[PDB]
Coordinates of C-alpha atoms and ligand atoms in Angstrom, one line a residue:
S19 CA 16.0 -15.6 12.6
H20 CA 14.6 -12.1 11.9
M21 CA 11.3 -11.3 10.3
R22 CA 11.0 -11.5 6.5
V23 CA 8.4 -9.4 4.7
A24 CA 7.2 -9.0 1.1
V25 CA 5.5 -5.9 -0.2
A26 CA 4.4 -4.9 -3.7
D27 CA 2.8 -2.0 -5.5
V28 CA 0.7 -2.2 -8.7
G29 CA 1.0 1.1 -10.6
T30 CA 0.0 2.3 -14.0
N31 CA 3.2 1.5 -16.0
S32 CA 4.6 -1.3 -13.9
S33 CA 4.4 -3.3 -10.7
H34 CA 7.1 -3.4 -8.1
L35 CA 8.1 -6.0 -5.4
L36 CA 10.4 -5.6 -2.4
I37 CA 11.4 -8.5 -0.2
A38 CA 13.3 -7.6 3.0
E39 CA 14.3 -8.8 6.4
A40 CA 14.0 -6.7 9.6
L41 CA 17.0 -5.4 11.5
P42 CA 17.5 -6.6 15.1
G43 CA 16.6 -4.1 17.8
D44 CA 13.0 -3.4 16.9
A45 CA 14.2 -0.1 15.4
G46 CA 12.1 -0.3 12.2
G47 CA 14.8 -0.9 9.6
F48 CA 15.2 -3.6 7.0
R49 CA 17.8 -5.3 4.8
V50 CA 16.9 -5.6 1.1
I51 CA 16.8 -9.2 0.1
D52 CA 15.3 -8.9 -3.4
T53 CA 13.5 -6.4 -5.7
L54 CA 11.6 -7.1 -8.9
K55 CA 9.9 -5.0 -11.5
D56 CA 7.1 -6.2 -13.8
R57 CA 5.9 -4.2 -16.9
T58 CA 2.2 -4.8 -16.4
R59 CA 1.4 -1.6 -18.4
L60 CA -2.1 -1.5 -16.9
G61 CA -2.7 2.0 -18.1
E62 CA -2.5 0.7 -21.7
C63 CA -5.2 -1.9 -20.9
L64 CA -8.1 0.5 -20.0
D65 CA -11.1 1.0 -22.2
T66 CA -12.8 4.3 -23.2
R67 CA -14.8 4.1 -19.9
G68 CA -11.6 3.6 -17.9
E69 CA -12.3 -0.1 -17.2
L70 CA -9.5 -2.5 -17.0
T71 CA -9.8 -5.1 -19.8
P72 CA -9.5 -8.8 -19.4
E73 CA -6.0 -8.5 -20.9
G74 CA -5.1 -6.2 -18.1
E75 CA -6.4 -8.7 -15.6
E76 CA -4.2 -11.3 -17.2
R77 CA -1.2 -9.1 -16.9
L78 CA -2.0 -8.2 -13.3
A79 CA -2.4 -11.9 -12.2
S80 CA 0.8 -12.8 -14.0
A81 CA 2.9 -10.3 -12.1
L82 CA 1.3 -11.1 -8.7
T83 CA 1.9 -14.8 -9.4
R84 CA 5.6 -14.1 -10.1
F85 CA 5.7 -12.0 -7.0
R86 CA 4.1 -14.6 -4.8
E87 CA 6.6 -17.2 -6.1
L88 CA 9.6 -15.0 -5.4
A89 CA 8.3 -14.2 -1.9
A90 CA 7.8 -17.9 -1.1
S91 CA 11.2 -18.6 -2.6
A92 CA 12.6 -16.3 0.2
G93 CA 10.4 -17.2 3.1
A94 CA 8.7 -13.8 3.1
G95 CA 5.2 -15.3 3.3
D96 CA 2.2 -13.3 2.4
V97 CA 2.7 -10.4 0.0
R98 CA 1.1 -7.1 1.0
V99 CA -0.1 -5.5 -2.2
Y100 CA -1.2 -1.9 -2.6
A101 CA -2.6 -0.5 -5.9
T102 CA -2.5 3.1 -7.2
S103 CA -4.0 5.1 -10.1
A104 CA -4.9 2.5 -12.7
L105 CA -7.0 0.3 -10.4
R106 CA -8.1 3.2 -8.2
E107 CA -9.9 4.9 -11.1
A108 CA -11.2 1.8 -13.0
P109 CA -15.0 1.4 -12.4
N110 CA -14.4 -2.4 -12.4
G111 CA -11.3 -2.1 -10.0
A112 CA -13.0 -3.9 -7.2
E113 CA -14.2 -6.9 -9.3
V114 CA -10.8 -7.1 -11.0
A115 CA -9.1 -7.2 -7.7
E116 CA -11.3 -9.9 -6.3
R117 CA -10.9 -11.9 -9.5
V118 CA -7.1 -11.6 -9.2
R119 CA -7.1 -12.8 -5.6
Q120 CA -9.1 -15.8 -6.7
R121 CA -6.5 -16.6 -9.3
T122 CA -3.3 -15.8 -7.2
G123 CA -4.3 -15.4 -3.5
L124 CA -2.9 -11.9 -3.6
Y125 CA -5.3 -8.9 -3.4
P126 CA -4.4 -5.6 -5.0
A127 CA -5.7 -3.2 -2.4
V128 CA -6.5 0.3 -3.8
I129 CA -5.0 3.1 -1.7
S130 CA -5.8 6.8 -2.1
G131 CA -3.5 9.3 -3.9
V132 CA -2.8 11.0 -0.6
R133 CA -1.7 7.8 1.1
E134 CA 0.3 6.9 -2.0
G135 CA 2.3 10.1 -1.7
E136 CA 2.9 9.6 2.1
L137 CA 4.3 6.1 1.6
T138 CA 6.4 7.2 -1.4
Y139 CA 7.9 10.0 0.7
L140 CA 9.0 7.4 3.3
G141 CA 10.7 5.4 0.6
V142 CA 12.5 8.4 -0.7
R143 CA 13.5 9.0 3.0
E144 CA 15.1 5.5 2.9
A145 CA 17.2 6.2 -0.2
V146 CA 18.2 9.9 -0.2
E147 CA 19.2 12.7 2.3
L148 CA 16.2 14.8 3.2
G149 CA 16.7 18.2 4.8
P150 CA 14.4 20.2 7.0
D151 CA 12.2 21.3 4.0
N152 CA 11.6 18.9 1.1
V153 CA 9.3 18.9 -1.9
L154 CA 9.0 15.6 -3.8
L155 CA 7.3 14.9 -7.2
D156 CA 6.3 11.4 -8.0
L157 CA 5.4 11.0 -11.6
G158 CA 3.7 7.7 -12.5
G159 CA 1.9 6.6 -15.6
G160 CA -1.5 7.7 -14.2
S161 CA -1.0 10.4 -11.6
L162 CA 1.5 12.9 -10.2
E163 CA 1.9 13.4 -6.5
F164 CA 3.3 16.4 -4.8
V165 CA 4.6 15.9 -1.2
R166 CA 6.1 18.4 1.1
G167 CA 7.7 17.4 4.4
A168 CA 10.6 17.6 6.7
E169 CA 13.2 15.0 7.8
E170 CA 10.8 12.2 8.8
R171 CA 7.4 12.2 7.2
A172 CA 5.0 13.9 4.8
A173 CA 3.1 17.0 6.0
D174 CA 1.2 17.8 2.8
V175 CA 0.2 15.7 -0.2
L176 CA -1.6 16.5 -3.5
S177 CA -2.4 14.0 -6.2
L178 CA -3.2 15.2 -9.8
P179 CA -4.2 13.3 -13.0
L180 CA -1.0 14.1 -14.9
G181 CA 0.4 10.6 -15.5
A182 CA 2.9 10.0 -18.3
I183 CA 0.5 7.5 -20.0
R184 CA -2.6 9.5 -19.3
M185 CA -0.9 12.6 -20.9
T186 CA 0.4 10.7 -23.9
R187 CA -3.1 9.6 -24.8
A188 CA -4.7 12.8 -23.7
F189 CA -2.6 14.8 -26.3
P190 CA -2.2 12.6 -29.3
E191 CA 0.8 13.5 -31.5
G192 CA 0.5 14.6 -35.1
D193 CA 3.0 13.9 -37.9
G194 CA 4.1 17.5 -38.6
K195 CA 7.5 19.0 -38.0
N196 CA 6.5 20.6 -34.6
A197 CA 4.1 17.8 -33.7
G198 CA 6.2 16.9 -30.7
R199 CA 6.8 20.5 -29.6
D200 CA 3.1 21.0 -29.8
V201 CA 2.4 18.0 -27.5
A202 CA 5.0 19.3 -25.0
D203 CA 3.4 22.7 -25.0
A204 CA -0.1 21.5 -24.5
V205 CA 0.9 19.1 -21.7
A206 CA 2.7 22.0 -20.0
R207 CA -0.6 23.9 -20.2
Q208 CA -2.5 21.0 -18.7
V209 CA 0.0 20.8 -15.8
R210 CA -0.3 24.6 -15.1
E211 CA -4.1 24.6 -15.2
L212 CA -4.4 21.8 -12.7
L213 CA -1.4 22.8 -10.5
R214 CA -2.2 26.6 -10.3
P215 CA -4.7 26.6 -7.4
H216 CA -2.3 24.6 -5.2
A217 CA 1.2 25.6 -6.4
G218 CA 1.9 27.7 -3.3
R219 CA 1.8 24.5 -1.1
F220 CA 4.8 23.2 -2.9
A221 CA 6.7 26.3 -4.2
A222 CA 10.3 26.8 -3.5
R223 CA 11.3 28.8 -0.5
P224 CA 15.0 29.6 0.5
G225 CA 16.4 26.2 1.5
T226 CA 13.9 23.9 -0.2
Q227 CA 15.3 20.7 -1.8
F228 CA 13.4 19.0 -4.6
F229 CA 13.4 15.3 -5.1
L230 CA 12.1 13.1 -8.0
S231 CA 11.0 9.5 -7.9
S232 CA 9.9 6.7 -10.2
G233 CA 10.9 5.5 -13.7
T234 CA 10.5 8.7 -15.7
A235 CA 12.7 10.6 -13.3
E236 CA 15.2 7.8 -13.2
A237 CA 15.3 7.5 -17.0
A238 CA 15.7 11.3 -17.3
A239 CA 18.6 11.3 -14.8
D240 CA 20.3 8.6 -16.8
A241 CA 19.8 10.4 -20.1
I242 CA 21.1 13.7 -18.6
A243 CA 24.2 12.0 -17.1
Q244 CA 24.9 10.3 -20.5
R245 CA 24.5 13.6 -22.3
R246 CA 27.0 15.4 -20.0
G247 CA 29.5 12.5 -20.7
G248 CA 28.7 9.4 -18.7
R249 CA 28.2 5.7 -18.9
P250 CA 24.8 4.1 -18.5
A251 CA 23.4 4.1 -14.9
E252 CA 24.4 0.5 -14.4
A253 CA 28.0 1.6 -13.8
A254 CA 27.8 3.6 -10.5
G255 CA 25.1 1.2 -9.2
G256 CA 22.1 3.3 -10.3
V257 CA 20.8 6.9 -10.5
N258 CA 20.1 7.2 -6.8
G259 CA 21.2 10.5 -5.5
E260 CA 22.0 11.9 -8.9
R261 CA 21.3 15.6 -9.2
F262 CA 20.2 17.5 -12.3
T263 CA 19.1 21.0 -13.1
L264 CA 16.0 22.4 -14.7
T265 CA 18.1 23.7 -17.7
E266 CA 19.5 20.2 -18.4
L267 CA 15.9 18.8 -18.2
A268 CA 14.6 21.5 -20.6
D269 CA 17.5 20.7 -23.0
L270 CA 16.7 17.0 -22.9
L271 CA 13.0 17.8 -23.5
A272 CA 13.8 20.0 -26.4
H273 CA 15.9 17.2 -28.0
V274 CA 13.1 14.6 -27.4
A275 CA 10.4 16.9 -29.0
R276 CA 12.4 17.3 -32.3
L277 CA 12.6 13.5 -32.6
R278 CA 9.9 11.2 -33.9
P279 CA 8.7 8.5 -31.4
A280 CA 10.8 5.7 -32.8
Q281 CA 13.8 8.0 -32.7
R282 CA 13.1 8.7 -29.0
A283 CA 13.7 5.0 -28.2
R284 CA 17.3 5.4 -29.4
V285 CA 18.0 8.4 -27.1
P286 CA 20.5 6.9 -24.6
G287 CA 18.8 6.3 -21.2
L288 CA 15.2 6.5 -22.7
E289 CA 15.4 3.1 -24.5
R290 CA 12.4 1.6 -22.7
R291 CA 10.1 4.6 -22.7
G292 CA 10.2 6.1 -26.3
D293 CA 6.4 6.2 -26.4
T294 CA 5.6 8.2 -23.2
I295 CA 8.8 10.0 -22.5
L296 CA 7.9 13.2 -24.5
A297 CA 4.7 13.9 -22.5
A298 CA 6.4 12.6 -19.3
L299 CA 9.4 15.0 -19.6
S300 CA 7.0 17.9 -20.3
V301 CA 5.1 17.1 -17.2
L302 CA 8.2 17.1 -15.0
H303 CA 9.5 20.3 -16.6
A304 CA 6.2 22.2 -16.3
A305 CA 5.6 21.1 -12.7
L306 CA 9.1 21.9 -11.4
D307 CA 9.1 25.3 -13.3
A308 CA 5.7 26.2 -11.8
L309 CA 7.2 25.5 -8.3
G310 CA 10.3 27.5 -8.8
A311 CA 12.7 24.6 -8.6
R312 CA 16.2 24.9 -10.1
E313 CA 17.8 21.6 -9.1
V314 CA 16.5 18.1 -8.1
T315 CA 17.8 14.8 -6.7
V316 CA 16.6 11.5 -8.1
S317 CA 15.5 8.7 -5.6
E318 CA 15.4 5.0 -6.3
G319 CA 13.2 4.5 -3.2
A320 CA 9.4 4.7 -3.7
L321 CA 6.0 3.3 -2.7
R322 CA 7.2 -0.3 -1.9
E323 CA 10.0 0.9 0.5
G324 CA 7.5 3.1 2.3
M325 CA 5.2 0.1 2.7
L326 CA 8.0 -2.0 4.3
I327 CA 8.8 0.9 6.7
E328 CA 5.1 1.4 7.7
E329 CA 4.6 -2.4 8.1
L330 CA 7.7 -2.8 10.3
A331 CA 6.6 0.2 12.4
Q332 CA 3.1 -1.2 13.0
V333 CA 4.5 -4.6 14.0
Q334 CA 7.2 -3.4 16.3
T335 CA 4.9 -0.7 17.8
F336 CA 2.3 -3.4 18.6
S337 CA 5.0 -5.6 20.2
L338 CA 6.4 -2.8 22.3
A339 CA 3.1 -1.8 24.0
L340 CA 2.2 -5.5 24.7
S341 CA 2.8 -7.3 28.0
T342 CA 5.5 -9.8 28.3
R343 CA 2.9 -12.6 28.4
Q344 CA 1.3 -11.3 25.2
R345 CA 4.7 -10.9 23.7
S346 CA 5.4 -14.6 24.3
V347 CA 2.1 -15.4 22.5
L348 CA 3.4 -13.3 19.5
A349 CA 6.8 -15.1 19.6
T350 CA 5.0 -18.4 19.8
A351 CA 2.8 -17.3 16.9
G352 CA 5.9 -16.4 15.0
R353 CA 7.5 -19.9 15.6
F354 CA 4.3 -21.3 14.2
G355 CA 4.7 -19.3 11.0
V356 CA 1.8 -16.9 11.4
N357 CA 1.8 -13.5 9.6
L358 CA 2.8 -11.2 12.5
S359 CA 1.5 -8.1 10.8
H360 CA -1.8 -9.7 10.2
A361 CA -1.9 -11.0 13.7
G362 CA -1.0 -7.6 15.2
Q363 CA -3.7 -5.9 13.2
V364 CA -6.4 -8.4 14.2
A365 CA -5.5 -8.0 17.9
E366 CA -5.6 -4.2 17.7
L367 CA -9.0 -4.2 16.0
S368 CA -10.2 -6.9 18.4
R369 CA -9.2 -4.6 21.3
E370 CA -10.9 -1.5 19.7
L371 CA -14.2 -3.4 19.1
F372 CA -14.0 -4.9 22.7
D373 CA -13.4 -1.5 24.3
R374 CA -16.3 0.3 22.6
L375 CA -18.7 -2.6 23.5
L376 CA -17.6 -2.1 27.1
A377 CA -18.3 1.6 26.9
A378 CA -21.8 0.9 25.5
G379 CA -22.6 -1.4 28.5
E380 CA -21.6 -4.9 27.4
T381 CA -20.5 -6.9 30.5
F382 CA -17.3 -9.0 30.2
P383 CA -15.2 -11.0 32.8
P384 CA -11.8 -9.6 33.9
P385 CA -9.5 -11.8 31.7
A386 CA -11.7 -11.4 28.6
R387 CA -9.6 -8.7 27.0
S388 CA -6.4 -10.8 27.6
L389 CA -8.0 -13.9 26.1
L390 CA -9.2 -12.0 23.0
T391 CA -5.7 -10.7 22.4
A392 CA -4.0 -14.0 22.5
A393 CA -6.6 -15.8 20.3
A394 CA -6.3 -12.9 17.9
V395 CA -2.5 -13.4 17.7
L396 CA -3.0 -17.2 17.2
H397 CA -6.1 -17.4 15.1
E398 CA -4.2 -18.5 11.9
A399 CA -1.9 -21.1 13.5
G400 CA -2.6 -24.5 11.8
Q401 CA -0.8 -26.5 14.4
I402 CA -3.4 -25.2 17.0
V403 CA -6.5 -24.7 14.7
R422 CA 3.6 -18.9 29.1
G423 CA 1.9 -16.7 31.8
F424 CA -1.6 -18.3 31.3
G425 CA -3.3 -20.9 33.5
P426 CA -4.6 -24.1 31.9
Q427 CA -8.2 -22.7 31.9
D428 CA -7.2 -19.6 30.0
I429 CA -5.3 -21.7 27.4
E430 CA -8.4 -23.8 26.7
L431 CA -10.5 -20.6 26.5
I432 CA -8.0 -19.2 24.0
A433 CA -7.9 -22.4 22.0
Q434 CA -11.6 -22.5 21.7
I435 CA -11.8 -18.8 20.8
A436 CA -9.1 -19.2 18.1
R437 CA -10.8 -22.2 16.5
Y438 CA -14.4 -21.4 16.9
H439 CA -17.1 -23.0 14.6
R440 CA -20.9 -23.5 14.8
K441 CA -20.8 -27.3 14.3
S442 CA -17.7 -28.2 16.3
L443 CA -15.5 -30.8 14.4
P444 CA -15.4 -32.9 17.6
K445 CA -19.1 -33.9 18.1
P446 CA -20.3 -33.4 21.8
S447 CA -20.8 -37.2 22.3
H448 CA -17.3 -38.0 20.8
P449 CA -14.5 -38.8 23.2
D450 CA -12.0 -36.1 24.0
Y451 CA -14.8 -33.5 23.5
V452 CA -13.9 -30.4 25.5
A453 CA -17.1 -29.0 27.2
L454 CA -16.3 -25.8 29.1
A455 CA -18.6 -24.7 31.9
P456 CA -21.6 -22.7 30.7
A457 CA -20.3 -19.2 31.6
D458 CA -17.1 -20.1 29.7
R459 CA -19.1 -21.3 26.7
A460 CA -20.9 -18.0 26.6
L461 CA -17.6 -16.2 26.8
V462 CA -15.9 -18.0 24.0
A463 CA -18.7 -17.3 21.6
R464 CA -18.9 -13.6 22.4
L465 CA -15.1 -13.1 22.1
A466 CA -15.1 -15.2 18.9
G467 CA -17.7 -12.9 17.4
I468 CA -15.5 -9.9 18.0
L469 CA -12.5 -11.8 16.6
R470 CA -14.3 -12.8 13.4
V471 CA -15.3 -9.2 12.7
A472 CA -11.7 -8.1 13.2
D473 CA -10.2 -10.8 11.0
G474 CA -12.7 -9.6 8.4
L475 CA -11.4 -6.1 8.7
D476 CA -7.9 -7.2 7.6
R477 CA -8.9 -9.8 5.0
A478 CA -6.9 -7.9 2.4
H479 CA -3.7 -7.8 4.6
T480 CA -3.5 -4.0 4.4
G481 CA -3.0 -3.2 8.1
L482 CA -5.0 0.0 7.4
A483 CA -8.5 -0.7 8.8
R484 CA -9.4 1.4 11.9
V485 CA -12.6 1.5 14.0
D486 CA -14.2 4.9 14.2
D487 CA -17.4 4.3 16.2
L488 CA -19.4 1.4 17.5
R489 CA -23.0 2.4 18.6
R490 CA -26.1 0.5 19.6
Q491 CA -28.7 0.6 16.9
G492 CA -32.1 -0.6 18.2
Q493 CA -31.4 -4.1 19.5
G494 CA -28.2 -4.2 17.4
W495 CA -25.1 -2.2 16.6
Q496 CA -23.6 0.2 14.0
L497 CA -19.8 -0.1 13.3
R498 CA -18.1 2.8 11.5
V499 CA -14.8 1.9 9.9
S500 CA -12.1 3.4 7.7
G501 CA -9.0 2.2 5.9
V502 CA -11.2 -0.7 4.6
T503 CA -11.1 -2.1 1.0
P504 CA -14.2 -3.6 -0.6
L505 CA -12.9 -7.0 0.3
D506 CA -12.6 -6.2 4.0
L507 CA -16.2 -4.9 4.1
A508 CA -17.4 -8.1 2.4
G509 CA -15.6 -10.2 4.9
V510 CA -17.3 -8.6 7.9
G511 CA -20.6 -9.4 6.3
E512 CA -19.6 -13.0 5.9
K513 CA -18.1 -13.3 9.4
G514 CA -20.4 -11.2 11.5
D515 CA -23.2 -13.8 11.7
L516 CA -21.8 -14.9 15.1
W517 CA -21.6 -11.3 16.3
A518 CA -25.2 -10.8 15.2
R519 CA -26.2 -14.1 17.1
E520 CA -24.5 -12.8 20.3
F521 CA -24.7 -9.0 20.2
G522 CA -27.5 -8.2 17.8
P523 CA -27.4 -7.3 14.1
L524 CA -24.4 -5.3 12.9
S525 CA -24.3 -2.7 10.1
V526 CA -20.9 -1.5 8.8
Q527 CA -20.4 1.9 7.2
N528 CA -17.7 3.7 5.2
Ligands
MG601 MG1 -6.9 -13.9 9.8

């Protein structure tokens, strides 16, 4: 029927999965099928150097396995996985991520703090009512993002090391009477020092609405509703859209600071966070106070909802600008069960690489661009290892399934031997295709070509949005490019 998609984000306290189905009309909307949270607590599995321990890698692979099983249990297919502060900052993040893909198939792709905030803002957009001027705080276990925007997307994003877990360990609590109050005071000072040079970007102006996301905000909104006389957030469906004030926050924080850590776990609504909630609430209070906020609204949408919005946008955008013939290839590719988001990205990068080669003086026949696009859309159709003549279809088949030593040996019956000009074409287009499939090996959709220059008798490709795994793939798959176009160096 309609397209099913799985996305997941690996954070510092927990990991989150969203499985959803697109909405007919190519509008960019989805219907939630399933959501799942895993308490990977990666921020508790770092060493003194910030490296993720083997126990952290066991916790990460466990959650992604559960995620990949729930996605397959719904037909969602490949899970797109972004990773935020804990992996971003671990010196062994890349090796951990490649190890976890070996064990699960899913690769935790590290995104930047600025991109994290942008995608989080889009997820907030899907859950709550944004006005013309919105400031959003997203407190995780590792970092705190500030995002300012209007009714559709983020304009400004700032990411600071003020995570609830980071702050709890940064300011260890004593056993005195005011030990808690002292932790809250010193965390408030850390927030001010780091936020001061940028607070103007996010300060309240007349008409500004403030929004909070993630589990600290959701727990705090539940504790404040239960203090004012309320049932747990399970009645009323959740905390989404709940509003609280800076005074009620400060009051809850004052209560938490007077309580010892095991007493914090028995504060209603904080049951699952008794160990970080003191420093977390201090962060939220100091940050909002520095910005001049008086009231906030809590959002249950976050990173994973923004990932689904962006993915659907890229897919439907690709489909819209495509010819009807190429659209039938996509539909066919869909009926074969290929990942359309991966297919769209490989075709876009294939086109960008092809276009710059042409600008630099590479000669290609007239249908070459069309054949590259269709083989790019179909490269991962196992059943094949409308608008096209029988020649073009064999060209496309041979581009999609290219290999040095062809499985059918040349002397073996049914061997398909294309005329020489067509053999030279298939190899050249297949070299572009391999490089492009390398650039989306991690299924991020974020790789972009910046520049493709001749370098001696070779080439120099500049690229962004690329994980370490995508860069490694281009090295493994660019041998054919180097055998047809000259050696290729990648950068950035
Ligand atoms: Mg591929």
